[PDB]
Amino acid sequence: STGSATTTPIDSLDDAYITPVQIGTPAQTLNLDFDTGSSDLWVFSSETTASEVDGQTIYTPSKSTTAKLLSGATWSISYGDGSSSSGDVYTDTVSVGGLTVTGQAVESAKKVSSSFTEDSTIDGLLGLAFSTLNTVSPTQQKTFFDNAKASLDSPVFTADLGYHAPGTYNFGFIDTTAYTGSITYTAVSTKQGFWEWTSTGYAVGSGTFKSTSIDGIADTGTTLLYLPATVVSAYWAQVSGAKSSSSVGGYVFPCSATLPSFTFGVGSARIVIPGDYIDFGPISTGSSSCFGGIQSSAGIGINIFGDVALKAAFVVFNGATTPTLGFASK
Ligand SMILES: CCn1ccc(CN)c1
């Protein structure tokens, strides 16, 4: 089997991407944030505290003839931005782009933090990291991809995120029309539960490529590119007036600037992020200070190849017995 679904930016900045997902019988379609940095499929629901729902579409398990309470199971997750959610668990039929999994754990939110409430466009998350990170207790649950994998034509999914435009998540096949050149594959460590890999270096604009190993994760659920402070300083030093602002929480730059590109290495191959992809717009409405899309990972503990980086590539998440990542230009 295969599946193919369009993923759409939630706003004009590509702050996140939503993909429609069918849950239950009859189908209830929710728009979920596909997140290769986490491993829980959770949804706003009829159980979510009413004051914490503000415009989201909810899953109502009592209206699904295939929903079953997973008795005793609870979940609770916290994310890198400090947001969080928790609740109980149903199993139900979940379909993405024509690919159907029966018995998928659908984690029903009883509580969500304010940042989720405030984002009316995201009805929940669909985790695509390794199932070892799934938070369901006392019986850990598998991701949608892990459950689908044996049925898939090939044990892979691909992310093709657009810049200010829709893109595609495919399951079970590699669309050879969706990228240019060849796909360069690189090793993955699953030791931390992430699609963790080592970039071979970087370049800023037209500058010379610096060969240096950068360990990080391919994370569709993180907006920006978070890299070591040395690398990020080298980038922003090429932008007149750019500075790190403690009050804003990262590098900002004059909105009048033209940003240089940023290149990252995948083995001997190179992915070029155009400068425009690094502009996240005014820090507040009407400001002439703009927020940068490349930020320091120093306070995180891990480097994150988030959407800013991934949207410049066609990305293969290869879930074979030994997982690997593939990157192609597009
Ligand atoms: C934009 C919604 N969101 C918040 C945290 C995550 C996971 N990185 C997704």
Residue numbers in the entry: 1 to 330
List sentences quoted exactly from the publication behind this structure.
The performance of this subset was validated in two fragment screening campaigns using the model system endothiapepsin (EP) and the NS2B–NS3 protease complex of the Zika virus. EP is an aspartic protease with the catalytic dyad formed by Asp35 and Asp219 and has served as a model protein for finding inhibitors for other aspartic proteases like β-secretase, a key target for treating Alzheimer's disease.
In our fragment screen against the ESFL-96 selection we identified 30 binding fragments, with a total of 42 binding events. The fragments are well distributed over the entire peptide recognition cleft. All but three binding events are within the peptide recognition cleft. Fragments were resolubilized in the soaking solution and for each fragment one crystal was incubated overnight. The automatically refined datasets were analyzed with PanDDA42 to identify fragment hits.
